[PDB]
Amino acid sequence: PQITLWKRPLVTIKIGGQLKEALLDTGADDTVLEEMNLPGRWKPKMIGGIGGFIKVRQYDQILIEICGHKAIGTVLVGPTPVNIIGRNLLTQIGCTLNF
Amino acid sequence: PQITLWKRPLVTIKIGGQLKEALLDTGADDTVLEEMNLPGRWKPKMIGGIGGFIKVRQYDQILIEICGHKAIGTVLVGPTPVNIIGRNLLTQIGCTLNF
Ligand SMILES: CCOP(=O)(COc1ccc(C[C@H](NC(=O)O[C@H]2CO[C@H]3OCC[C@H]32)[C@H](O)CN(CC(C)C)S(=O)(=O)c2ccc([C@H](C)O)cc2)cc1)OCC
């Protein structure tokens, strides 16, 4: 689909078998989701945003379906203010900016 | 044009008579620019994201040119780590997400 930006580009995602809402975020290198339970191993990681750094849990090679498009990649889980889909997965679903 | 997301969507902007590099950021409601001493009145504001909040100065009705496309709107100035073009201006240049 084509998504305009008059509203926040929020979409429904499916991860770990559960539905959530997430923001398509071209300014994010990586994908960061609010605190949740995901199966499998994970490693601690740090990520920095506009206000500083936070501790996240890094889950690699995670299946995630974004607006009907499948991706398999890295998902960071931690105290982000909002579920954000970053470029690591936006590229997988073929997302581009156009103007 | 069409901008793929393999790398950060960085573009040249013109503001306050100066050229700068800025990120086309669909995850940003508003536009946040590096410290610059723009003329005119402003009001203080707090904006937050990953890692907490920072203090910025809000200027209204500021003209920005983004890849040759002109836009006019609110710009927040402060110690942001990167220049962020948000939806308030991205809409004005007809920017969409597409997949
Ligand atoms: C020298 C390098 O600096 P740095 O590493 C941080 O640099 C960056 C800082 C911020 C961004 C943009 C930001 N992206 C990330 O947070 O992405 C995270 C995850 O993926 C990683 O890639 C990039 C960073 C990591 C979002 O797109 C937009 N945000 C909102 C989302 C969170 C809802 S927002 O910015 O908070 C924000 C909030 C309110 C408003 C107005 C008020 O509406 C405008 C903008 C990009 C790079 O230093 C660390 C201290």
Curated annotation (Swiss-Prot), chains A, B:
Domain Peptidase A2: start-end pairs: 20-89
Active-site residues, record numbering mapped to chain: 25 (for protease activity)
Superkingdom, natural source: Viruses
Start and end residues of each stretch annotated as Dimerization of protease: 1-5, 49-55, 88-99
Summary of subunit composition and partner proteins: Homodimer, whose active site consists of two apposed aspartic acid residues.
Name by which UniProt lists this protein: Protease
This protein's encoding gene: gag-pol
First and last residues shown, out of full length: 501 to 599 of 1447
